[PDB]
Design a binder for this molecule. Structure first.
Ligand code: HEM
Ligand code: HEM
Ligand code: HEM
Lengths: 726, 726, 308, 83
């Protein structure tokens, strides 16, 4: 039952493009990629080659194919301890998934700051540009279970665990800069409304159902993050191509004791990019693991996810200087008013070895801060501080979840806590309490100070009566959705209209749709009217006369809110499909592959069957996938070289591949006789912006395609796609 | 610094006698003691001296005395993550106790065979007299909770984990050679009957209640082990002075495939010794931790518990040679018929560092066997095989309880099991199934063989129908109880009678007592009449005429069944109380301590207050405890030196000390005017056997006392003790 | 039939003095003692007389004495679903004990006010003397495990659950009027110092050990409750003869919104009474269930524990 | 047991039998039924041995396994008839 004689079962332990080798555990794929956290996990890494199969008690197994029975056709016997331990472990494999963010994908990496930030914070991980901090990052969706699809419309989580010399700091953020609700007390109501409805547990991974829109229509504080979710921000192309945000205002505390308010940002160095709805939704069917796969394969290829940490900083004396409350997590701070200061870079450069042990069991919690940081009274942040530790208790089995290897600090940890389920650490301290004399009071408290000090809270003044009451300053719900709307390009606005229209069409109770449209009329009447037209709703005279909400501190738009208004495209790590024929013109394929290689763009060679085809010069070309098996959904652009085009000219899958790519706004390039495919996408002979065509592939043809790919999608084609049957 | 300036907070890291120093974690008390398992635990041992106090995430704490509040008389705030982590861990410290044997005391040690047993077993741990195998041993009671008392009347558990090079072997035995029941189906019934009654949860630690004796009276198979429990075997002096037994017949399998039946024995090298019932019972009140303390203090003193492993071996062809079924766990194999062959020595030489992490979390299970051993169809053993894996699941939190450090093998273990709560090992195998080609099928099965082979079951023939039926050969209940009863000394018989008499007097429903007396009359009429007289019950003419059961294979006694018939007294590690007065004669004390020291016997110097006293010659004498503080129950003998005897002659506690010791059959030695105490225990002037007396405490005064100690207790005193008001 | 012909296996369902009859579940000893909470539990009470022995799935069992085997001296078979269920249930009977107060004894009863307290509180259970509120009360020690002894020297817990028409109110108190420490951040340190020491898990049920006195010596705020514990308050004669206190100042709030500060007390109508030390210590050996037994038997006798 | 939290999963409403169920099993996490039987073991006399075993019969009888003949040696072996 062995491996093939040629060694082809084992992936090369070097960087390789997606599809070139089977994927593997990180420590086998990239054994030389190290950091202090990855090294610390070596105590618990288990090999396998050359080892005997055993029970968990170390007894070697002779026959792992059969249960013990009284005769070979007889009953199974109770005394088969080998069968019993294997089946017992299997029967207890599953642990509860996370209440929210159950679907997620993670990797290891490292961070380092660009310069010391000691004038604004004493946090050790930001004190020295040459001090590197290992990280572990998990990206997630919010609503769906751990077996749900990746490219759903949803907010995404972006959680980073920094293993610092002064403790673990978890920055537990999302990919939009606000949340849906203002006070943690409402979190279970909001989550219950977006999650599958309770009688039948439908729908998975979707906010397109009555209960979500019922809640939104009755809680207008949700409308800002709803706008984000209905835009193409809700359907990122990759976890590499979305922004992150801590949402809450936190504090930085320097060695002099000065507090500065801060909001955290991650900027993707691969740039911002999103799918379009129909593409996203079909990809949940054709590849429900698309983002998990893309992240893993980018790290294997050396296309490491990179992100810049950024801080918006506000001095303490400017707390009340905006027209919204800084402590309101439904409000963003526009970068036109407070710029994001660049702070450091994070690089994700190694995949885990075992998804369950490292990803599934990782525990992130925003209460895990370090000296030099502090909280604020944001009432959503305040309630989060209760929930992360308590949940990690039923999910991970007990109070020792910090001893699960992925969660362990790499700095020292010593205290008087003892026992609890699955206790690993064996304490030798004669004392388990303090103050004690019997161990000379060790381990000891440490006064706060500029470095290596004990944690002390910032001594914020508190004055008020004990109340359950929302601050009046939080009761403004429409100005930030309007600012967002007006900062989007015209095509992004169209996609927001379509996202609300699609979702509310799936709400069965028509009055809920009408109440959402009335909320939209309080944001922008153009938006309201465009959604109402798709729902066959007519706005009333009163609704047409609602006064628009005020500008946000004088702003009419802020272009940093748009994905696309400011070009930021980076083609390295993108992928093109190359549709082969049985006699490819090898000069075209040479020119194509050379130009893609120079820009770090990968190729996938597709055909109508698997195996190999031979080019005109004898080059044998292995086929990555069939046209049906790896649809246009999964690539960024499509190139069709010349050769024997008659082999594929009448193939329905090949023609549909181009039609889907065209409808989804992807760049298409056709060389030579492949130009006959222009006819299937039912447009021009003089050509069209977005379709690169030439007698042969070459420097100029590839340059033009690569420039298209740098702009991500061909937005100009939008009006030509409603007629295409695809 | 809170430690005293003179360093007297820290115990000496060297062997010291009981009470000389405070006790400590084993690796701090005996850092030079090692073995392969202790060395492998080093990676999870945590120190304390010189480290900062932190959260579990490694953040240094500055103030561990106060919660975060809004003003120093204000409400506590939810953002106090340091308080929250500390209270959350504490809130979750407890795990379920074991269903039975919840009260237990454990130690590390090692085992070595005296010679290779390869002719009868291929078990690696028995293959070489130079091969030393680490062990971890837990002794326990059965019925009471983890917080119940040590010196109850009960069966004791004796469980040994051997960390072999071919797997963990757990020998999970008790301190009697049979069990109460024949088939595992009845275990919940028996245990429910012995355990506190379900309406009110009384009594703890005791079988002296209606439900236990109701079950016994209805299930005469229980009578053999009940006889053992009612004897002084139910009240051992120490875990170091009891026997252990595997109970079941197992098999040894050699390299040629030959099976030999085997029953396992532990022989205590300190000899056999037990308390008397009134002493045991009072000790549960004065020191409920007396056996746990004694085991720990013996190891800290260097009085290491030592046991010889022995095998009773029966050839396969002798399966049916006895009057009873070898597979019946209510029958013993008399050592007159099959002698115990010595196999090796186990020495327990290190205490744990942390009781919870190493004792509470240890998991022993008799299904953990290694190549060279195998099971038999004993129907109690068969059912045990189901129970120990399952229970260790709710108890220890999941299917990865072998990764808890004390449970881990020291030999390699590799397999395709994955996940489960609290998974520590991070598997790098590309495959999690076999057969596989992707990892060339590793880890791989191993054929059985003479050494280092895979486990294969012995191919025993099975023939019969699927039935729920007890074998007729098991249906004999009285002959082994009678052999036991006949093998006892007269004083041991008297204690058995008194054990039954006391227990049945606590049974509230009189017919249950009557039904039990009827079962006794099927064993031995003398026994049944003596118990009946104590209960005011008169035997009928029919009961007086029940034919005794037959002898066992012609035996009418076997002295190996008695604790005391064949003297095996060791005094090393025993303890003597020395009662001081305010002006002790130093020449007496010097003599006493010198002789005790030469024989390895400990002393505790007692008085009517703490502090010190001064001898006649000015020597300062440190007092260990007061008369009331360390009662006679806790020592093996009592010595009173001369001096100012009028200081203590009318001290009620000093008098009571001697009466208690006397009642409990302990040797008592009186020097000089300490002979005035004869009147308080009613001793005549010619003296009496068991009271050592003289003008001073030498020539042969110490030799006579140490001779009485070697014989444990003064049995011949028993007729005199009923008069003494104590 | 295994019961004796004369029926002396079954205690009479009428009050009887301690030792006169075997003790029995409450609903069999006193079937006509009722309150709203005891009546609401009727849906989950299960009987036994005249019913067949079954699996948990309702399958009747024919032989509850033997495992299924291949021949009557053969190996046990994995298809024995009856054995498997019965052993699986037994293997999971235990749950974690309480972190503190693990040893306790409980009874049902009821509470009634002497007068309407509406001028000081709007709490509905205090609003009318004819309003009866069921209670369930658990008394406990603090340090020992659930199988430790009753007459140790310790603080005792006195916890009452009031099943009111406006919600459950739990009054979770002890038998002395203060506690050992000031701020909850220190609770795990104090409890760890009083509990059995971590290396060897001794001593059970006792504060007479180095780490407790270490902490006391270093934390003089403890000294007041230590005084109480070393007095005979630390060794009550019975749960019926000790006082109870909520310890903390709470607030009462009336219908006008006025707050009054309040501390809560329970006064034993049987009076206050304690053991002496040598008697208490010896009793932990002769009857470690002494307090649990005394409470049960007092109720079976009609000597109901009463507290104001 | 691990999925549903303990050995009393039969008392979760959807899993409950609609016929009678009585036995001597007790306790476990999440125990809903409050047993009033003085006995939690059998054989017992203190409750006249109830609940009681029921012999097999044509209707409403105790379960008994069919007495199939077993013959062979203790082996980990796939029957050749399955190959
Ligand atoms: C700004 C608003 C919030 C953001 C950005 C946020 C972000 C996230 C992210 C990214 C995760 C997944 C961490 C991972 O990958 O494992 C998560 C999990 C969780 N969140 Fe939050 N969340 C927010 C609000 C809240 C609120 C208000 C609560 C409850 C009061 C909460 C309770 C949870 C819980 C229960 C989990 C599961 C944690 C676990 O099992 O380990 N979240 N959150
Ligand atoms: C010969 C008869 C038996 C002997 C000598 C025996 C011995 C022991 C001993 C010494 C322990 C304590 C191990 C330790 O110190 O942790 C124990 C625990 C246990 N026994 Fe047995 N026992 C016997 C029969 C049974 C049977 C028939 C069953 C169930 C079918 C059973 C179920 C258990 C369970 C559930 C535990 C607690 C295990 C744990 O939580 O780790 N015992 N037994
Ligand atoms: C005046 C001070 C306190 C008193 C009077 C008090 C009283 C009690 C009582 C009577 C019980 C047992 C309830 C029962 O019978 O089930 C109990 C249990 C408990 N107490 Fe407190 N206690 C106090 C302080 C604390 C503090 C400061 C903490 C933690 C910060 C705490 C945590 C606990 C916990 C964890 C249990 C176990 C509860 C359970 O498992 O159900 N106690 N306490």
């Amino acid at each position: 039952s062995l491996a093939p004689e040629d060694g082809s079962h084992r992936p090369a332990a070097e960087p390789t493009p997606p599809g070139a080798q089977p994927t593997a555990p990180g420590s086998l794929k990239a054994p030389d990629t190290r950091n202090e956290k990855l090294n610390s996990l070596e105590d618990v890494r288990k090999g396998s080659e050359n080892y005997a199969l055993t029970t968990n008690q170390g007894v070697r197994i002779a026959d792992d194919q059969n249960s013990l029975r009284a005769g070979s056709r007889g009953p199974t016997l109770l005394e088969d301890f080998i069968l019993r331990e294997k089946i017992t472990h299997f029967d207890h494999e599953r642990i509860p998934e996370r209440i929210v963010h159950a679907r997620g994908s993670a990797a290891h990496g490292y961070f380092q700051p660009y310069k010391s930030l000691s004038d604004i914070t004493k946090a050790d991980f930001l004190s020295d540009p040459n001090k590197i901090t290992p990280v572990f990052v998990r990206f997630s969706t919010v609503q769906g279970g751990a077996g749900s699809a990746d490219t759903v419309r949803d907010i995404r989580g972006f959680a980073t665990k920094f293993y610092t010399e002064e403790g673990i700091f978890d920055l537990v953020g999302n990919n939009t800069p606000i949340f849906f609700i203002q006070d943690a007390h409402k979190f279970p109501d909001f989550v219950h409304a977006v999650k599958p409805e309770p009688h039948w547990a439908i729908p998975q991974g979707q906010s397109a159902h009555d209960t979500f829109w019922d809640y939104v229509s009755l809680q207008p504080e949700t409308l800002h993050n709803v706008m984000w979710a209905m835009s193409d921000r809700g359907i990122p192309r990759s976890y590499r191509t979305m922004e992150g945000f801590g949402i809450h205002t936190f504090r930085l505390i320097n060695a002099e004791g000065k507090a500065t308010f801060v909001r955290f940002h991650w900027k993707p160095l691969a740039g911002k990019a999103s799918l379009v709805w129909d593409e996203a939704q079909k990809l949940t069917g054709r590849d429900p693991d698309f983002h998990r796969r893309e992240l893993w394969e980018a790290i294997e290829a050396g296309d490491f996810p990179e992100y810049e940490l950024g801080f918006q900083l506000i001095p303490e004396e400017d707390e009340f200087k905006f027209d919204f409350d800084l402590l309101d997590p439904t409000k963003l701070i526009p970068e036109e008013l407070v710029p994001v200061q660049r702070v450091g870079k994070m690089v994700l450069n190694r995949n885990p070895d075992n998804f369950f042990a490292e990803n599934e069991q990782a525990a992130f919690h925003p209460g895990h801060i370090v000296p030099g940081l502090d909280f604020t009274n944001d009432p959503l942040l305040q309630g989060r501080l209760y929930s992360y530790t308590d949940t990690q208790i039923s999910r991970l089995g007990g109070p020792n979840f910090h001893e699960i290897p992925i969660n362990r600090p790499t700095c020292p940890y010593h205290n008087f806590q003892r026992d609890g389920m699955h206790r690993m650490g064996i304490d030798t301290n004669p004392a388990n309490y303090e103050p004690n004399s019997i161990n000379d009071n060790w381990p000891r408290e440490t006064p706060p100070g500029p470095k290596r000090g004990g944690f002390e809270s910032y001594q914020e003044r508190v004055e008020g009566n004990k109340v359950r009451e929302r601050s009046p300053s939080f009761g403004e719900y429409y100005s930030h959705p309007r600012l967002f709307w007006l900062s989007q390009t015209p095509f992004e606005q169209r996609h927001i209209v379509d996202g609300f229209s699609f979702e509310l069409s799936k709400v069965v109770r028509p009055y809920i749709r009408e109440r959402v449209v009335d909320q939209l009329a309080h944001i922008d009447l153009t938006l309201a009217q465009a959604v109402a037209k798709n729902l066959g709703i007519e706005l009333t005279d009163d609704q047409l006369n609602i006064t628009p909400p005020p500008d946000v501190n004088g702003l009419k738009k802020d272009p940093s809110l748009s994905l696309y208004a400011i070009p930021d495209g980076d083609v390295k790590g993108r992928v093109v499909a190359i549709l082969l024929n049985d006699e490819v013109r090898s000069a075209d394929l040479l020119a194509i592959l050379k130009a893609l290689k120079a820009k770090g763009v990968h190729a996938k060679l597709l055909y109508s069957r698997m195996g190999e085809v031979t080019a005109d010069d004898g080059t044998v070309l292995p086929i990555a996938a069939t046209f049906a098996g790896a649809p246009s959904l999964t690539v960024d652009a499509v190139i069709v070289p010349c050769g024997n085009i008659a082999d594929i000219a009448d193939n329905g899958d090949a023609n549909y591949y181009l039609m889907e790519a065209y409808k989804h706004l992807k760049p298409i390039a056709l060389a030579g006789d492949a130009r006959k495919f222009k006819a299937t996408i039912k447009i021009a002979d003089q050509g069209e912006e977005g379709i690169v065509e030439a007698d042969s592939a070459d420097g100029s043809f590839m340059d033009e395609l690569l420039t298209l790919m740098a702009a991500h999608r061909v937005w100009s084609r939008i009006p030509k796609i409603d007629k295409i049957p695809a």
